[PDB]
Amino acid sequence: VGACVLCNSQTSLRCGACIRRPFLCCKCCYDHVISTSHKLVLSVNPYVCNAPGCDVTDVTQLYLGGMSYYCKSHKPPISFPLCANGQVFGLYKNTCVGSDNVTDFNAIATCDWTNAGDYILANTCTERLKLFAAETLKATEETFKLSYGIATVREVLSDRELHLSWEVGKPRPPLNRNYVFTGYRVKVQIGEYTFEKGDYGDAVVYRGTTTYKLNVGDYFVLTSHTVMPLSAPTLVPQEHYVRITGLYPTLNISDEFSSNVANYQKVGMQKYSTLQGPPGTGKSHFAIGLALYYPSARIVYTACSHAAVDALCEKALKYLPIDKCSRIIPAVECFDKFKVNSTLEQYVFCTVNALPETTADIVVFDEISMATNYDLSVVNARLRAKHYVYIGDPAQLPAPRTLLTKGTLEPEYFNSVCRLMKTIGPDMFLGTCRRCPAEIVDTVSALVYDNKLKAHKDKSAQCFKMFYKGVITHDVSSAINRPQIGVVREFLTRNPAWRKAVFISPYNSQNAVASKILGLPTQTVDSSQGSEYDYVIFTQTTETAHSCNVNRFNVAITRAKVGILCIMSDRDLYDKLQFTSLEIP
Amino acid sequence: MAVGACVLCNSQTSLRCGACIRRPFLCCKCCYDHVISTSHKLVLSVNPYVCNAPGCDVTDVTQLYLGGMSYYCKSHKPPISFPLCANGQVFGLYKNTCVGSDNVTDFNAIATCDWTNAGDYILANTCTERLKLFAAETLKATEETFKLSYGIATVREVLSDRELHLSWEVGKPRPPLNRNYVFTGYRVTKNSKVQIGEYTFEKDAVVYRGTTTYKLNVGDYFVLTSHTVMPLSAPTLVPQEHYVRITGLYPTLNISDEFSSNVANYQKVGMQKYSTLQGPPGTGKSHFAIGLALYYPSARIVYTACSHAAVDALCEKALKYLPIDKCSRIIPARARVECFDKFKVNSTLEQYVFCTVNALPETTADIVVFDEISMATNYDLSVVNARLRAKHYVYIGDPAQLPAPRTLLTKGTLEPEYFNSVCRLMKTIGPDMFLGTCRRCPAEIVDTVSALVYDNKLKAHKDKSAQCFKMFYKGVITHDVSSAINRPQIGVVREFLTRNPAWRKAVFISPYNSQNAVASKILGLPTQTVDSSQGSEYDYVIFTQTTETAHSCNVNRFNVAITRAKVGILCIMSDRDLYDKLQFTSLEIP
Ligand SMILES: [Zn+2]
Ligand SMILES: [Zn+2]
Ligand SMILES: [Zn+2]
Ligand SMILES: [Zn+2]
Ligand SMILES: [Zn+2]
Ligand SMILES: [Zn+2]
């Protein structure tokens, strides 16, 4: 017995076919079962046929026979169907309300989350359907990992490479950071690993958790936890105040953070606030300066990824008292220059999924484009705060929707925060890029930021572009372009000053091939977000939708502080690059 | 001609913009608004607005003055003078009766774009009707003039009557060697030269197909075939007129049950001025267009379309149902391309006239049937209404099928609502008629494209053939001068071919003709391209996606590609997106 998810009317009915088993009242449960393939209704007892050996569980074929339930072939004379007059029979049938958005619920409840419109709907529906979609989406993700085969250790080459055997028949998962395995030995549980495909032979690369000498015969399954029910909304109702409510602003604010004076004020005069901080505009600067402007404020700094949390720590290590900070870590080697798992310190740095239950004066949520609605709900459910600051850039990378194979997910459907930034606009917008040369800045400014991103630097005259399709050779789940490595290898002898450049490409395997030939430090576009380097060498590798994504390209070319070389494959993005075109050797 | 009507507000003028490839007439007001907000500074009157001093190269109208009785710059102007471009106007005739425009912004973006972005065509299909025509002429003249920028090819070595080696001019670009780029061949004689027909190339050597058939020698050279672009006058669509009863058209008393499921649509045609027909693959567009004449047996009908092959298919259908003495196939004497020869030639007054848009005469008709409307541009639509003053207009085609190859468009994807005016109505307000039953394809293909591009409104006639297969295999992509090559994908078909020998009757279809050429060397099947297979049908089809690019993943291209099969189809897919949309049987990769 609980509350219907659509209209909160109390009910004893749950849909036995939905993966979340939501509470649906008599009318909502009717409108769900008649227009979907979901027919199993659970109550204080399941709505199945009470006859010996009968397997009729379809509620639309079931009848209320006194106290029991029956199909047509086993019903008593005095009986009527459970589904009639727009209601499924159940407790509190007289006290129903019904809903006006059952249509969206049906599509959320029955989709397989492979289409982009499944995520669009999960972000344009009501708040209670946003939580149900996140539960159902994550439950489908965890369940779908069951179909992937187990990874058997075929050979242990080194402490960082090995050979894997794959189960015949069952599909194989893409080997990157998004897929996390659990290792067994036959009876110990070996640990928690990830995989990546290098360049030497059939060998993969592993980055494990608990140290262990894994032997031939060990098998890796996949890391699947349990999806917890959501209770808190993605965004609490916005509260506006005319004075700074709940905070004590300082009057001796240093020069470094005086430009953001009209910003932390807005943080104090609102319940939540959204700041869009494009690359190199001092996002982390704004976040840390909030702590100095409100020096007594207990502040929780959180993000999804460990690297985004660690970056906030390295910036905090410079301007904040070390003993008043803590890095919350769950049982990846992350920031380790604070005191670990000290929940009560004034400044808490912690990933979303590992957050504890506490309160705070201000909560800062960074890298908001990487956040899912599930994450937004968890933050509100774990952190009771006077002010929530959501920091990120909808024109940067989103969370990896592993099931999404059909369609393109636009930034306004990443989460509730990104949706507001793309519709009513963000509350604050850091519009001066102080990292990149004018060529890069002006390129992304017209590419994603609608000419709002301004350059604090001159043209560097060291940003070059080259159109050179080359040869694309794919492997197990990545792409490789050696001819594009060939151009860069040529470039590194003609321009020996660029030997200090970082190689960036949309693919892990090409980076390993880049490392093998060039020797440059390699970095995927995913792991490069929130980072900066003087020189950057980028090969687009392929002409796919993955390497042509403008958000991925925005992050890629905005890693440079001095110069960049873009070996391009797609015509449009090359023609949109405001760089000096180079002649093909 | 120095005097005409302003292209924006129709006021008479003695001014034309010399920087615009079309030299449109612009009034005193419109000319000023155009020159001051763009880089177009050359204005033409009876004489060009340029400085007439010995040795001066000043041609900016904003730096010139009318002095004495000529045009001079600031350095050379006589004391008594006045500026040519000032006070909101460029000087010229009828300076008191000018109207001006409300927004030249659309005209300026049409007149200064390079037509390499998809947004350039979006504007060309959303502007006012007079700007659609100007944008049609501007795009078309840009295409033809850019053709002249390519280098000339020369035969250096002949390998057979199919393959030959080409020599190319140094320093000039070389055209992509596909079926879209047609060349005019030339052979050298004692003096001068002579034209030896038209040719297309494919795939280090190339394979050629000619309008005629010579055993061409070394030294023959090919220049991309260029065409002049006439000015446009008529709209892309006539004004709409819904009538109370069937006007100018008389139904038949009894009718065949071949075209019985079209009687509702046939009456819809006869009560509104123009009408649209969306007909998916299979379906039977030509059967409908011909049966329309049997419902109004006395109606004069002009069947038109862009390509000769599209007009030829209507002739073959009319040969089966319409009197042959009632049909005339119009063939322009210019360019003698092999077309339909079973009808009398160039009889404009015949009851059934079959003619391409480019060769249309100036006549009238009870009904005009414009077939394959997705392949048309707004230029074609304007020509049809300028040459053919009809009583009804029926546009047949499919917005989900391929459009005219926009050769200049290399950045962005053009959506069906921006193909032309007719597809714009079909994609927004919906087509007047829809043929919802597909007779050609096995049910797997039909349910796919019905859920892919047809809103599940396309109904399968056949059953599940159980011979529709799909494989996910990216393989190895290699590029050459103008296409791509996926040898591992062809090597995948080879293991499949020796496993299923009956599939040697299948047609090979890949988005690029380079991958096609390599298939006819390891496999052997007859190869086609999605654009070179539109309209026709085959038993078995073997499709290799080759790449994951926007060209290989175009939903319209993939819609046409997979709907060429009557029985079975094998898809070696690169895109996970379209692979998962294919309701086919999957296979493991050996
Ligand atoms: Zn359900
Ligand atoms: Zn309810
Ligand atoms: Zn029963
Ligand atoms: Zn002009
Ligand atoms: Zn005018
Ligand atoms: Zn002069």
Author numbering:
A (entry chain E): 2 to 187, 192 to 336, 340 to 593
B (entry chain A): 0 to 202, 207 to 593
Excerpt from the paper describing this PDB structure:
Firstly, the Zinc binding domain appears to be fairly flexible with rotations of 10–15° around a single hinge point located near residues 104–105. There is no obvious connection between the conformation of this domain and crystal form or nucleotide bound status as variability between chains within a single crystal forms is equally large as when comparing between forms. We have determined the crystal structure of SARS-CoV-2 NSP13 in APO, phosphate-bound, and nucleotide bound states.
The SARS-CoV-2 Non-structural protein 13 (NSP13) has been identified as a target for anti-virals due to its high sequence conservation and essential role in viral replication. A long 30 amino acid linker that does not adopt any secondary structure links the 1B to the 1A and 2A RecA-like core helicase domains.
